[PDB]
Amino acid sequence: PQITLWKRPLVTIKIGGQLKEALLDTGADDTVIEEMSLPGRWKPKMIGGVGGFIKVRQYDQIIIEIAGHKAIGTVLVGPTPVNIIGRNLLTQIGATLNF
Amino acid sequence: PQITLWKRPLVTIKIGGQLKEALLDTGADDTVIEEMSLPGRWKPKMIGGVGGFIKVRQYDQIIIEIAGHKAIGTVLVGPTPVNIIGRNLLTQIGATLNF
Numbered sequence A, B: 001p002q003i004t005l006w007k008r009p010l011v012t013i014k015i016g017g018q019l020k021e022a023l024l025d026t027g028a029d030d031t032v033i034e035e036m037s038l039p040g041r042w043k044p045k046m047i048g049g050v051g052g053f054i055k056v057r058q059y060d061q062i063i064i065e066i067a068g069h070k071a072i073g074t075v076l077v078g079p080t081p082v083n084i085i086g087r088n089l090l091t092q093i094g095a096t097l098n099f
């Protein structure tokens, strides 16, 4: 698809068998999702945005469908205000910015 | 141009007579620049992201040149850790996400 930016670029994702809404975010290095259960071990990480930093849980090699495209990669879990698909998984689905 | 997302999508902008580097950020509703002077009226605003909220000055009808493309709109000025070009100006340069 070609997604314009007049509204938020929200898509459906599927993770752990559950559908969620997430933002395609070229300003995010990292995918970060709201609190949920994921399999395996996690590692600590801090991520910093406009209001400061938060602690998140880093899960690696997580299966996640994004707008119907399959990705397998790192998902951060923590008190983000919105689910965000960052560049680590945008590259897996072949996304580019065009103007 | 077509900008891949292996690295942060940074571009050169011109704003208020000044050249700056800024992030093309589809996850940002609004454009937010580090502290600088801009002419004209402003009003205070709070914007929230990961980490919480910051207080900014909202300047309307500001012209910015973004990687060679002129646009006008609202620019928020405050203690953002990174200069961010948000959707309000991305739309004006015809930026899309494609995959």
Ligand SMILES: CC(C)CN(C[C@@H](O)[C@H](Cc1ccccc1)NC(=O)O[C@H]1CO[C@H]2OCC[C@H]21)S(=O)(=O)c1ccc(N)cc1
Binding pocket: A025, A026, A027, A028, A029, A030, A031, A032, A047, A048, A049, A050, A081, A082, A084, A086, B023, B025, B026, B027, B028, B029, B030, B031, B032, B047, B048, B049, B050, B082, B084, B086
């Ligand atoms: C500020 C950026 C350099 C980094 N952010 C991504 C950014 O796109 C967020 C993503 C985002 C979106 C909604 C809520 C929180 C964060 N947008 C944002 O802060 O935009 C603000 C300006 O316009 C407003 O519209 C959205 C909030 C305001 S971030 O959310 O802090 C973040 C940082 C690191 C990772 N790995 C993932 C996300």
Ligand SMILES: [Cl-]
Binding pocket: B072, B073, B074, B088, B089
């Ligand atoms: Cl605007």
Ligand SMILES: [Cl-]
Binding pocket: A004, B094
């Ligand atoms: Cl358009």
Ligand code: NA
Binding pocket: B039, B040, B041, B059, B060, B061, B062
């Ligand atoms: Na103005």
